[PDB]
Amino acid sequence: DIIIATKNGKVRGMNLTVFGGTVTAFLGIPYAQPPLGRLRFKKPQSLTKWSDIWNATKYANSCCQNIDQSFPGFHGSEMWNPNTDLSEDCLYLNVWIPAPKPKNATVLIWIYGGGFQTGTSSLHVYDGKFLARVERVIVVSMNYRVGALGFLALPGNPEAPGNMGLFDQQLALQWVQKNIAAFGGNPKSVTLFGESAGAASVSLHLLSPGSHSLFTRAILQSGSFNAPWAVTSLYEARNRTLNLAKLTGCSRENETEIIKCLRNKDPQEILLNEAFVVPYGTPLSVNFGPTVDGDFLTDMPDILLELGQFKKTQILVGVNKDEGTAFLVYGAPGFSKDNNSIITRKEFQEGLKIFFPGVSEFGKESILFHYTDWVDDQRPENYREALGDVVGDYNFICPALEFTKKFSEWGNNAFFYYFEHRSSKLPWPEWMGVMHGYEIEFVFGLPLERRDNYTKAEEILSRSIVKRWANFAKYGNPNETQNNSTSWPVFKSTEQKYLTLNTESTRIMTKLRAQQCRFWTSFFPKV
Ligand SMILES: *[C@@H]1O[C@H](CO)[C@@H](O[C@@H]2O[C@H](CO)[C@@H](O)[C@H](O)[C@H]2NC(C)=O)[C@H](O)[C@H]1NC(C)=O
Ligand SMILES: *[C@@H]1O[C@H](CO)[C@@H](O[C@@H]2O[C@H](CO)[C@@H](O)[C@H](O)[C@H]2NC(C)=O)[C@H](O)[C@H]1NC(C)=O
Ligand SMILES: *[C@@H]1O[C@H](CO)[C@@H](O[C@@H]2O[C@H](CO)[C@@H](O)[C@H](O)[C@H]2NC(C)=O)[C@H](O)[C@H]1NC(C)=O
Ligand SMILES: *[C@@H]1O[C@H](CO)[C@@H](O[C@@H]2O[C@H](CO)[C@@H](O)[C@H](O)[C@H]2NC(C)=O)[C@H](O)[C@H]1NC(C)=O
Ligand SMILES: *[C@@H]1O[C@H](CO)[C@@H](O[C@@H]2O[C@H](CO)[C@@H](O)[C@H](O)[C@H]2NC(C)=O)[C@H](O)[C@H]1NC(C)=O
Ligand SMILES: C#CCN1CCC[C@H](CN(CCOC)C(=O)c2ccc3ccccc3c2)C1
Numbered sequence: 001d002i003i004i005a006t007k008n009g010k011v012r013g014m015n016l017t018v019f020g021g022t023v024t025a026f027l028g029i030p031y032a033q034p035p036l037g038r039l040r041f042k043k044p045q046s047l048t049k050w051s052d053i054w055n056a057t058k059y060a061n062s063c064c065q066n067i068d069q070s071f072p073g074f075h076g077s078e079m080w081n082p083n084t085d086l087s088e089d090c091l092y093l094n095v096w097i098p099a100p101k102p103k104n105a106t107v108l109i110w111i112y113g114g115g116f117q118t119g120t121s122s123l124h125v126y127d128g129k130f131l132a133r134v135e136r137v138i139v140v141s142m143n144y145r146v147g148a149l150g151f152l153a154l155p156g157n158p159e160a161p162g163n164m165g166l167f168d169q170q171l172a173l174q175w176v177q178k179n180i181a182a183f184g185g186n187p188k189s190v191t192l193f194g195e196s197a198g199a200a201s202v203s204l205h206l207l208s209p210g211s212h213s214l215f216t217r218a219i220l221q222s223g224s225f226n227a228p229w230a231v232t233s234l235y236e237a238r239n240r241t242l243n244l245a246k247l248t249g250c251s252r253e254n255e256t257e258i259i260k261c262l263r264n265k266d267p268q269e270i271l272l273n274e275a276f277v278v279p280y281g282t283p284l285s286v287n288f289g290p291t292v293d294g295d296f297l298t299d300m301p302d303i304l305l306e307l308g309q310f311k312k313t314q315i316l317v318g319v320n321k322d323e324g325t326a327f328l329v330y331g332a333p334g335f336s337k338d339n340n341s342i343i344t345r346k347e348f349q350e351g352l353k354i355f356f357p358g359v360s361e362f363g364k365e366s367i368l369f370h371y372t373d374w375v376d377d378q379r380p381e382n383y384r385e386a387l388g389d390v391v392g393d394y395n396f397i398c399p400a401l402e403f404t405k406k407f408s409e410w411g412n413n414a415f416f417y418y419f420e421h422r423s424s425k426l427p428w429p430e431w432m433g434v435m436h437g438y439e440i441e442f443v444f445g446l447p448l449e450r451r452d453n454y455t456k457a458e459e460i461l462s463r464s465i466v467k468r469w470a471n472f473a474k475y476g477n478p479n480e481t482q483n484n485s486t487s488w489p490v491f492k493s494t495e496q497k498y499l500t501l502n503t504e505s506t507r508i509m510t511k512l513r514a515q516q517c518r519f520w521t522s523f524f525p526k527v
């Protein structure tokens with residue numbers, strides 16, 4: 001029988017067969033009191049104790065969220081939908097352990113993304129059993145509250161203070177410190193990693209003094225807190241909370257009356273109204289997400305970064321080649337998952353209106369001029385590839401590069417990667433290239449499963465990425481082997497070296513997309 005004693009009671013796990021070896025999996029351990037009823041919208045409350053043996057043998061409930069239903073039956077969109085029942089009782093976590101039980105294992109903690117509105121730890125592309133089997137690390141993932149139930153902000157008031165989802169993540173990190181030794185783990189070797197809004201979350205733990213002792217190192221994939229979609233100003237967050245009151249018949253004169261009204265609504269009543277708290281909106285809109293609450297974030301993150309008031313440790317950062325394409329089919333005209341989506345100069349300018357609603361007519365004309373210095377004039381797909389580049393450069397790549405420079409300027413090793421391989425199994429058309437979030441299967445080693453119809457070059461690439469990530473976690477250096485392997489050099493603000501990751505050749509390069517990023521950091525802010 002597989003039983004571990006925790007500070008909150010005993011828990012029973014389950015064995016899994018992986019690559020001829022055993023992995024011990026504890027799915028669905030509770031780490032906080034269910035935020036139900038009076039607890040809705042408050043910081044998570046520490047768990048007391050159950051008085052029995054909790055059976056952690058099935059993934060628990062994903063948190064309450066809307067569901068992407070644009071393409072019914074399409075794996076490319078539905079693989080991101082939660083594969084468990086939705087519920088407000090969702091603060092659970094999952095632990096994978098190599099067998100035999102390690103003595104002092106390094107812990108990797110996965111934080112899913114989903115624009116702070118969606119996501120669950122129970123998806124198949126987040127299965128952590130291969131990482132525990134192949135690199136003998138312990139893998140942990142937790143559910144956190146998303147959307148208004150996670151980030152409704154009345155700043156100052158303990159009844160809806162903001163960043164409740166980040167406090168959910170933080171409380172799960174506290175659980176790892178207090179309990180992971182009972183599983184074989186070293187709480188002095190904990191590595192946060194996540195993608196998209198999960199990366200943004202990871203980058204925010206580097207700023208929050210409460211998280212500074214709960215982890216060692218960080219990996220940020222396709223995201224950072226300086227991305228334009230990641231942090232709401234103090235009063236925009238408030239102006240959105242008051243609008244959700246009015247939309248649900250909950251406006252009052254007392255703040256706590258607004259909240260106690262909002263505790264009596266159905267979850268579905270709140271979910272259906274989330275999309276209307278904002279006037280404009282883009283495919284990249286984050287209605288309720290992290291904000292400057294004064295507790296977790298004591299100041300605007302860019303200031304804290306510039307002043308060097310953050311955890312000094314090693315980071316690993318990167319982006320995918322075609323980050324923006326995924327958002328084009330969800331709102332730009334002339335784009336469909338079912339053609340090659342070749343578009344005109346008029347449709348390009350309609351797209352720019354969709355993604356830059358408040359930008360002046362001159363700003364849209366400046367973005368157009370900077371992104372149309374064609375190599376070949378036709379090339380009919382020029383405008384299709386320029387719009388994906390605008391969206392990805394503005395929202396993901398130039399944020400990641402700007403965060404890496406400024407972070408490395410304070411004396412810690414940063415390593416930057418550029419993921420350029422499209423997966424043979426990618427359910428989306430070839431014109432969308434290396435999409436947002438499709439490096440993930442490689443990081444979790446899904447191509448290592450020989451029975452899964454991945455190519456031999458995709459197993460080698462993913463065996464290489466898994467090794468480097470596990471090495472970075474263990475030793476702060478993303479090496480593969482000492483011999484016969486490309487060295488990954490540190491990112492430095494002058495040379496700005498990065499490593500490309502693909503199946504042909506991993507190469508060292510310099511100043512990723514510098515001519516495009518120069519536009520977004522030094523000319524667009526003045527429009
Ligand atoms: C975990 O599983 C065990 C069995 O797999 C559960 O044990 C049963 O508990 C019920 C509850 O009263 C008893 O009626 C059964 O006789 C028990 N059977 C055995 C074989 O022990 C246990 O309750 C489960 N844990 C939880 C929290 O539900
Ligand atoms: C697991 O490794 C850690 C270090 O990563 C050991 O913990 C402490 O490490 C510090 C240095 O950071 C030393 O000053 C302490 O002396 C260590 N603690 C002890 C009790 O010696 C930890 O001991 C290891 N745990 C094992 C091997 O079970
Ligand atoms: C690509 O596929 C779409 C899907 O039908 C085609 O349809 C247009 O899609 C845009 C997207 O917002 C709409 O604004 C248009 O109204 C749609 N057209 C019609 C006639 O309904 C699109 O035309 C296709 N383009 C190519 C070149 O195949
Ligand atoms: C990757 O590089 C690190 C150096 O940063 C190597 O770390 C050493 O690992 C051994 C165990 O293999 C430890 O006993 C040493 O204390 C480590 N040294 C340092 C300075 O961290 C690591 O082994 C390398 N990995 C590979 C596969 O070559
Ligand atoms: C050193 O390791 C490299 C991996 O980076 C090996 O390179 C590949 O080797 C296979 C043969 O097993 C070829 O099919 C690939 O085309 C090679 N990739 C390249 C050249 O980028 C290499 O074989 C190893 N060499 C030694 C001497 O150990
Ligand atoms: C669920 C839901 C709502 N539905 C329509 C809005 C888009 C949503 C899916 N979707 C974007 C599509 O690509 C994954 C997101 O939830 C989303 C939204 C904003 C994001 C912002 C930054 C990074 C990832 C994001 C993902 C599906």
Ligand SMILES: *[C@@H]1O[C@H](CO[C@@H]2O[C@@H](C)[C@@H](O)[C@@H](O)[C@@H]2O)[C@@H](O)[C@H](O)[C@H]1NC(C)=O
Binds near residue numbers: 244247
């Ligand atoms: C706050 O937001 C206002 C717009 O909100 C409007 O009303 C709510 C109930 C929603 O239905 C929303 O779609 C509407 O557009 C602005 O009018 C107001 O200026 C904003 N104020 C500040 C300070 O941001």
Ligand SMILES: *[C@@H]1O[C@H](CO)[C@@H](O)[C@H](O)[C@H]1NC(C)=O
Binds near residue numbers: 001100
């Ligand atoms: C689980 O695995 C361990 C070692 O891998 C084994 O000794 C134990 O019997 C297994 N328990 C099962 C299969 O219930």
